């Protein structure tokens, strides 16, 4: 718990389209081999791009290749495309019978919008603060609201705010929630305290209504909250 050992790989690498990118990883047991796994977003499942140092799965383009040299391995992507943007995890094993990963290398390849943040792990009885940053429109003339969705459940209205600052809250969160807006920063904020397990879920900000869900024309991508 207070100790960890992982494979070493770089945090990030940037490339223009069409370039050849190489990412190297080191560590693992002395005779170990290596694989590489692509995860295009934290919510998508990894896929293998290279296994056993240098083999491609059938569904992977030939522009992906790999090699091993000693206790290092290298992933090469020729002709990088925007679609190749992802975190690439190396994996292998230690000198014992345990699997090991690297921390992952993020590959970066060099309109009305709403962007939520502030979620993550939370303690029962604790509090959270979510913020949505809007852009691409006159923020001050729109009502805004938050909607959430518990794991394997439907959409639930949480709170909303009108253009004169009137606020409205769902019974589920009454007494514990505060929604506010900062027209200068084009942000809306949702504070929620005395967290319960029922507060767990994905939280979306959306534009157009405060309590009138029918007026919503634009949704953020959400932020996950786990109590």
User: Closest distance between its own copies and the C-beta of residue 40, in Å?
Assistant: 13
User: Closest distance between Cl ion and the C-beta of residue 215, in Å?
Assistant: 6
Q: Between β-strands 105-109 and 12-15, what pairing exists: parallel, antiparallel or unpaired?
A: parallel
Q: Which of 1, 4, 16, 31 binds Cl ion (CB under 5 A)?
A: 31
Contacting residues for 64 by C-beta, under 8 A, at least 6 apart: 49, 50, 56, 75, 76, 77
Decide: is 30 part of the binding site for Cl ion (CB under 5 A).
Answer: yes
What are the structure tokens assigned to 218, written together? 């634009």
- How many other β-carbons are positioned within 10 Å of the β-carbon of residue 211? 17
Decide: is 208 part of the binding site for Cl ion (CB under 5 A).
Answer: no
Q: DSSP assignment of 43-76, as one string? A: TS--EEEEBTTTBPPTTS-TTEEEEEETTEEEEE
Considering CB distances under 5 to 8 angstroms, the limit depending on partner class, which of Cl ion, its own copies, none binds residue 108? none
* Comparison of 19 and 162: residue with beta carbon closer to its own copies: 162
* Comparison of 139 and 204: residue with beta carbon closer to its own copies: 204
Decide: is 191 part of the binding site for Cl ion (CB under 5 A).
Answer: no
Considering CB distances under 5 to 8 angstroms, the limit depending on partner class, which of its own copies, Cl ion, none binds residue 95? Cl ion
User: Which residues of this protein are in contact with its own copies, per CB under 8 A?
Assistant: 32-35, 37, 39, 42-43, 45-48, 51-53, 55, 57, 89, 91-93, 97-104, 120-121, 145, 147, 149, 151-152, 154-157, 160, 168, 170-171, 197, 200, 204, 208-209, 211-222, 224, 226
Considering CB distances under 5 to 8 angstroms, the limit depending on partner class, which of its own copies, Cl ion, none binds residue 220? its own copies
Binding positions for Cl ion, 161-190, rule CB under 5 A: 162, 164, 166
* Comparison of 139 and 146: residue with beta carbon closer to its own copies: 146
Considering CB distances under 5 to 8 angstroms, the limit depending on partner class, which of Cl ion, its own copies, none binds residue 152? its own copies
Dihedral sign computed on CA atoms, order 163, 165, 171, 176: positive
Contacting residues for 198 by C-beta, under 8 A, at least 6 apart: 150, 172
Q: How far apart (Å, rounded) are the C-alpha atoms in residues 171 and 227?
A: 19
Dihedral sign computed on CA atoms, order 198, 202, 208, 212: negative
* Comparison of 149 and 191: residue with beta carbon closer to its own copies: 149
| Burial (CB count <10 Å: 0-12, 13-18, 19+), residue 106 | middle
Breaks after residues in the chain, judged by C–N over 2.5 Å: 110
Residues engaged in binding Cl ion (CB under 5 A): 29-31, 95, 162, 164, 166, 209-212
């Amino acid at each position: 718990s207070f100790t960890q050992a992982a494979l070493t790989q770089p945090s990030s690498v940037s490339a223009n389209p069409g370039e050849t990118v190489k990412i190297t990883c080191s560590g693992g047991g002395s005779s170990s081999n290596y694989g590489w796994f692509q995860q295009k977003s934290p919510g998508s499942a990894p896929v293998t791009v290279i296994y056993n140092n240098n083999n491609r799965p059938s569904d992977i383009p030939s522009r992906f290749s790999g090699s091993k040299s000693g206790s290092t391995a290298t992933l090469t992507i020729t002709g990088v495309q925007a679609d190749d943007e992802a975190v690439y995890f190396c994996g292998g094993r230690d000198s014992t019978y345990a699997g090991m990963f690297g921390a992952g290398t993020t590959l970066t390849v060099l309109a009305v919008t709403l962007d939520e943040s502030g979620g993550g792990l939370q303690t029962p009885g604790g509090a959270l603060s979510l913020v949505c940053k809007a852009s691409g429109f006159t923020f001050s003339v729109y009502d805004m609201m938050w909607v959430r969705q518990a794991p394997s459940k439907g959409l639930e209205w949480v709170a909303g705010i009108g253009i004169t600052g009137s606020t409205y809250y769902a019974s589920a969160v009454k007494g514990r929630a505060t929604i506010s807006r900062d027209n200068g920063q084009s942000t809306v904020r949702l504070q929620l305290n005395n967290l319960r397990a029922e507060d767990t879920g994905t939280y979306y900000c959306a534009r157009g209504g405060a309590y009138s869900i029918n007026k919503l024309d634009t949704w953020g991508q959400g932020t996950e909250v786990i109590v």
